[PDB]
From a paper:
Our analysis of the enzymatic mechanism of TarS was facilitated by the capture of various TarS1-349 structures encapsulating the catalytic domain in complex with metal and substrates. These include the native structure with bound Mn2+ (free enzyme), the UDP-GlcNAc bound structure in the presence and absence of Mn2+ (the binary Michaelis complex), and the UDP bound structure with Mn2+ (product complex). Native and UDP bound structures were also obtained to similar resolution. The structures of native and UDP bound TarS1-349 were similar to that obtained for the lower resolution UDP bound full-length TarS (overall main chain root mean squared deviation (rmsd) of 0.56 Å over 335 atom pairs), with minor differences in the linker region (320–349). Based on these observations it may be inferred that in the native structure, the SA loop is disordered allowing binding of UDP-GlcNAc, upon which the CS loop moves closer to the active site center and the SA loop becomes ordered, occluding the active site channel. Trapped sulfates from our crystallization condition were also observed in the TarS1-349 structure along two basic grooves leading into the active site centre, potentially indicating where the phosphates of the acceptor polyRboP may be bound. Kinetic parameters for wild-type and TarS1-349 constructs were similar, indicating that the trimerization domain appears to be dispensable for UDP-GlcNAc hydrolysis activity. The results show that although TarS1-349, lacking a trimerization domain, retains some processivity (133 ± 14), its Pintr is reduced compared to wild-type (2400 ± 260) indicating that oligomerization does appear to contribute to TarS processivity.
Author numbering: 1 to 204, 217 to 349
Write the structure that this text describes.
C-alpha cells in the first residue's frame, strides 16, 4: 500500500466522522491506503462510529487496555501495524483535503521524498505554522528553510525511514514528545520536501518538557552529519525554542517560588548544548543560554526583565546594536538586536 493514515483516538466521538469522511472523499483508491485507528481506551463509542467505515475504508482498529494519557503510545502501536509505504498522523479533531493523497502520491513518485510536509490551514481561528509553506519545494534542508519551526507529526513520513532508524514517539514523556519524533525524522531523511499547491491538513511541570529538549540536543549532536552542520541545526532549534516555546519569558510569568524548578530543568537541557553553539544563536539569546547553563535564575530573570522594560544596567550602542551588561560585575553581551 501507498499510505497509512494513523488516527489516535480518546473520546473522539464528537468529530471523528468529519475526519473519517475526508478519508472517504479521497480522490485516491481505498485499495492503496489504510486507516490505522488505535484507541486510547475511550469511554464513548468512537470505535463504533469508526466501525461504520470498515466496508468503505481499508481499516485497522486496536484499543489499548488502559489510557496511556497521550497520543504517543497510540501512534506507536499504529506505526508498528502499518503496512503502507508512507505514513500520515492525523488528529481525530481534524480533517484533510480530498486531493491530499492524490497530490502527495503524485509528488512522492516525482521526487522520492522521505519526509513530505503538506501545507496546513487553520479552521475556526486556529494558529498554524506558515513560514515554511509559502512555496512548493522538492528539496529543503534544516538550514535553508524553516521546517524546524514545525515539528508536529501532521506530515508524511516514509515508513521504513521511521522503522529502519527506530524513530518512535516518546511514551514516558508527555509534553512536546512529537518534537523529538519529527526532529529524528528530519535528521535521518535523505530528502525532505514541502508541498503547498493548496491547503491539505486542516487544523481545528518542566522536568518532562526539558527532558525532551535535552534529548533533541543529544539527537542533533550525535547525528551522522558534519560537525559544523550539527552545531548550526542545534542553533536554529534553540532560536525557535527560545522564541516560541514556554521557555520564552518564563521568569516573567512563572511564580517566583517555582522558578528554581524551571532553571534547574532548563539548565540540564542547556548543559547538553556546547558553549561554542551560543555564538551561532541569535545574539539576544546568548545571555539567556549563559545563565541557564549556570542555573542562575536571578541573573536570568534580570535579563528577561531588562529586555521587557528596556532598562539595562549598562549598555553601549555599536553598529546600531546593543552591547549590554545586565548586572554589576557580569560580562557584556554584544550585538543584541
Amino acid at each position: 500500500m501507498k499510505f497509512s493514515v494513523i488516527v489516535p483516538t480518546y473520546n473522539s466521538e464528537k468529530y471523528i466522522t468529519e475526519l473519517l469522511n475526508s478519508l472517504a472523499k479521497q480522490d485516491f483508491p481505498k485499495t492503496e491506503f489504510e486507516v490505522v485507528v488505535v484507541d486510547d481506551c475511550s469511554t464513548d463509542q468512537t470505535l463504533q462510529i469508526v466501525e461504520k467505515y470498515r466496508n468503505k475504508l481499508n481499516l485497522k482498529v486496536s484499543q489499548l487496555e488502559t489510557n496511556s494519557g497521550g497520543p504517543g503510545k497510540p501512534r506507536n502501536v499504529a506505526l508498528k501495524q502499518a503496512e503502507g509505504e508512507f505514513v500520515l498522523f492525523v488528529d481525530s479533531d481534524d480533517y484533510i483535503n480530498k486531493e491530499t493523497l492524490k497530490d502527495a502520491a503524485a509528488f512522492i513518485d516525482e521526487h522520492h521524498s522521505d519526509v513530505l510536509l503538506i501545507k496546513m490551514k487553520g479552521v475556526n481561528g486556529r494558529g498554524v505554522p506558515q513560514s515554511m509553506f509559502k512555496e512548493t519545494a522538492p528539496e529543503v534542508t534544516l538550514l535553508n528553510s524553516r521546517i524546524i519551526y514545525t515539528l508536529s507529526p501532521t506530515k508524511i513520513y516514509r515508513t521504513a525511514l521511521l522503522k529502519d532508524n527506530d524513530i518512535y514517539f516518546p511514551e514516558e514523556l508527555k509534553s512536546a514528545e512529537d518534537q523529538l519524533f519529527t526532529m529524528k525524522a528530519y535528521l535521518n531523511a535523505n530528502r525532505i520536501s514541502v508541498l503547498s499547491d493548496k491547503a491539505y491538513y486542516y487544523a481545528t511541570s518542566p522536568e518532562d518538557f526539558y527532558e525532551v529538549m535535552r534529548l533533541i540536543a543529544v539527537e542533533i549532536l550525535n547525528a551522522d552529519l558534519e560537525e559544523a552542520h550539527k552545531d548550526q541545526i542545534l542553533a536554529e532549534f534553540l532560536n525557535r525554542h527560545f522564541s516560541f516555546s514556554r521557555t520564552n519569558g518564563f521568569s516573567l510569568k512563572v511564580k517566583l517560588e517555582e522558578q528554581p524548578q524551571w532553571i534547574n530543568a532548563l539548565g540540564d537541557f542547556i548543559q547538553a548544548v556546547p558553549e561554542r553553539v551560543d555564538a551561532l544563536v541569535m545574539s539576544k539569546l546568548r545571555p539567556l543560554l549563559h545563565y541557564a547553563r549556570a542555573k542562575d535564575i536571578d541573573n536570568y530573570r534580570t535579563v528577561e526583565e531588562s529586555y521587557r522594560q528596556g532598562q539595562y544596567y549598562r549598555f553601549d550602542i555599536v553598529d546600531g546594536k546593543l552591547n549590554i551588561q545586565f548586572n554589576e560585575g557580569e560580562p557584556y553581551f554584544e550585538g543584541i538586536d
